[PDB]
Ligand binder design. Structure first.
Ligand SMILES: CC(C)(COP(=O)(O)OP(=O)(O)OC[C@H]1O[C@@H](n2cnc3c(N)ncnc32)[C@H](O)[C@@H]1OP(=O)(O)O)[C@@H](O)C(=O)NCCC(=O)NCCNC(=O)Cc1cc(O)cc(O)c1
Ligand SMILES: CC(C)(COP(=O)(O)OP(=O)(O)OC[C@H]1O[C@@H](n2cnc3c(N)ncnc32)[C@H](O)[C@@H]1OP(=O)(O)O)[C@@H](O)C(=O)NCCC(=O)NCCNC(=O)Cc1cc(O)cc(O)c1
Lengths: 421, 147
């Protein structure tokens, strides 16, 4: 051992330098280099500590894997039980108050933590299962939703109709640009759709926009909120990891329920098929979503892109999933070089099932919904998803992503690009 | 057209003519026709035709022009502000109101500027080589923005 003590020591040097040095941007080069070196020693020890102790740490927090904790609860509890391993709620609030450029990068420590947890064959699957459980917010809204067929949330409007959960993304002023609230809404809505027994199929679609350049037109997604990202308001844990391990993973695998119904022994998860309809365009996080649907429809004029090839963050699990859809050459053209793919080009058929003229689209969406109803579809989509993406594959990738993305979230190149938007 | 013969010397001197529906500029040997009805997506009427034929005539007659370029200009209507648009075709409002002429619009464009893009301008016997090339023709490029 020796590693916990050495870490505690390196974290204290960091806190002493932060307490004594000037604010970020008033620091000299010597001072900038000193604090960077301190952060580096500490982060190195977080990695080494967790390489050997991750399972024991996770066992402490979850009572030897008998309590499912979601990400936000897990990292908070880790901070209080293991001071210096990951940041406290207080330390985060100071960070959140700063613009990205000025942050110390404490979230990186959370990336280290989550990487180590997800790498573990014991802890990893368990945390993934916790994130497939229904959100409390969704359990609380479920009876009203069953009664009313309707919930209005800040970023998402959800409506049950003809056996379909219609999720409409409705941030009309900013092209459905994504943030932490949207993720919370999306997961909540996805949870409701899955738990509601009067829902047989899901539908995800962008709502009518109100910004002058798009007034009266639907738009699917313009991807991550770049303004908020610059201003410091995009959370590694509560946005970037939450969406991947929560609603998006639930689209694929369903919601993990308690043993409280017949058939649980064969289907612990309630999964349903999902249709996405793309109006205008799907960019970044929105394009990423398409890699998880059972059916994808697009308007003739639409395009699909993951644009931040030069100075962007990793586009979620597109690096995991895209290759299976498009092969390695196209996958690199899209992600490494920012190739944008139009609905009407032949290669769109790698991502999109049906491309339809704007005036034929509503009806085509309605028909697609009726084709995905039965139990044969449920069984087949489950078997298809299992073959397409193994639980190990997903876990291994999300483990490395957790840290790789954390590092990109603080990269100088990203902070600069994002500040210019 | 007479209108083109009358504007030709100023055009040769200046490299530039502003018309109601078309802006014409000589640059690097290229006649750049920009269709510039920014309020209505270059919707066509009798005046646009006159301007087009005039511009096409100038481009063909001007000896410092070797190639033509047709392109839509930047729009100003709110739904297209800052975006180029090539053409939304015939002015349907005018057509309803009675202002689309069979002869001065629908036949004129086909037999005039459009046919001149294909066959060139018929000149008088007033230059060497007329016996083999009574028509001055040049190549044309079109660039389509929007639709
Ligand atoms: C969509 C566009 C091409 C349209 O161009 P225009 O028609 O000229 O529109 P604009 O006027 O710029 O946008 C209209 C309107 O939406 C706003 N808008 C559009 N997209 C955004 C984003 N992404 N953020 C913030 N605001 C936005 C824009 O600022 C305008 O509002 P005001 O500033 O208040 O006027 C353009 O707006 C654009 O470039 N948007 C940004 C596209 C982009 O780079 N998105 C981010 C890609 N990167 C990710 O998703 C990263 C990501 C997401 C994830 O979910 C996970 C992950 O691991 C990584
Ligand atoms: C082009 C559009 C799809 C753009 O649509 P939106 O994105 O809905 O934008 P809009 O707001 O409609 O257009 C902006 C602006 O341009 C005006 N606009 C656009 N296209 C036109 C046309 N063709 N005419 C008149 N005004 C037009 C429109 O009315 C708006 O201004 P306001 O009326 O002040 O609101 C739409 O406007 C439209 O439907 N245009 C008409 C398309 C059409 O059928 N055109 C005529 C087709 N038929 C021919 O050209 C026939 C023809 C032509 C010839 O030259 C020779 C011949 O032998 C036969």
């Amino acid at each position: 051992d020796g590693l916990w003590a050495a870490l505690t020591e390196a974290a204290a040097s960091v806190e002493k330098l932060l307490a004594t040095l000037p604010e970020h941007g008033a620091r000299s080069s010597a001072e900038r280099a000193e604090i960077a070196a301190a952060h580096d020693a500490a982060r190195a020890l977080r990695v080494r500590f967790l390489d050997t102790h991750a399972d024991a740490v996770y066992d402490r927090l979850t009572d030897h894997r008998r309590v499912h904790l979601r990400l936000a609860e897990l990292v908070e509890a880790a901070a209080t039980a293991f001071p210096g391993l990951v940041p406290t709620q207080q330390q985060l609030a100071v960070e959140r108050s700063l613009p990205q450029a000025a942050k110390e990068g404490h979230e990186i420590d959370q990336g280290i933590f989550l990487r180590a947890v997800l790498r573990s064959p014991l802890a990893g699957p368990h945390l993934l299962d916790a994130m497939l459980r229904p959100t409390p917010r969704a359990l609380e809204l479920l009876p009203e939703f069953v009664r009313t067929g309707e919930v209005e949330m800040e970023a998402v409007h959800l409506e049950r109709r003809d056996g379909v959960a219609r999720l409409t993304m409705c941030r009309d002023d900013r092209l459905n640009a994504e943030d932490g609230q949207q993720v919370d809404d999306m997961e909540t809505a996805v949870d409701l759709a899955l738990l509601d027994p009067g829902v047989r199929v899901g539908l995800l679609r962008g709502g009518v926009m109100s910004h002058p350049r798009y007034r009266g037109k639907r738009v699917f997604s313009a991807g991550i909120n770049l303004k908020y990202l610059s201003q410091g308001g995009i959370s590694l844990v509560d946005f970037l990891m939450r969406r991947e391990l929560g609603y998006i993973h639930k689209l694929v695998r369903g919601v993990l329920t308690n043993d409280d119904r017949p058939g649980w022994w064969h289907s612990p998860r309630i999964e349903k098929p999902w249709v996405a309809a793309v109006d205008g365009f799907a960019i970044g996080g929105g394009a990423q979503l398409l890699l998880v649907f059972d059916r994808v429809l697009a308007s003739s004029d639409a395009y699909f892109s993951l644009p931040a090839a030069k100075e962007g963050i990793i586009p979620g699990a597109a690096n995991l999933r895209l290759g299976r859809f498009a092969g390695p050459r196209v996958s690199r053209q899209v992600i490494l070089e920012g190739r944008r793919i139009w609905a009407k080009e032949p290669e769109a058929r790698l991502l999109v099932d049906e491309v339809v003229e704007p005036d034929e689209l509503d009806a085509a969406i309605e028909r697609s919904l009726t084709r995905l109803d039965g139990d044969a579809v449920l069984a087949n989509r489950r078997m298809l998803n299992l073959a397409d993406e193994s639980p190990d594959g997903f876990r291994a990738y999300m483990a490395e992503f957790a840290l790789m993305q954390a590092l990109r979230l603080y990269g100088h190149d990203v902070i600069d690009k994002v500040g210019r938007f």
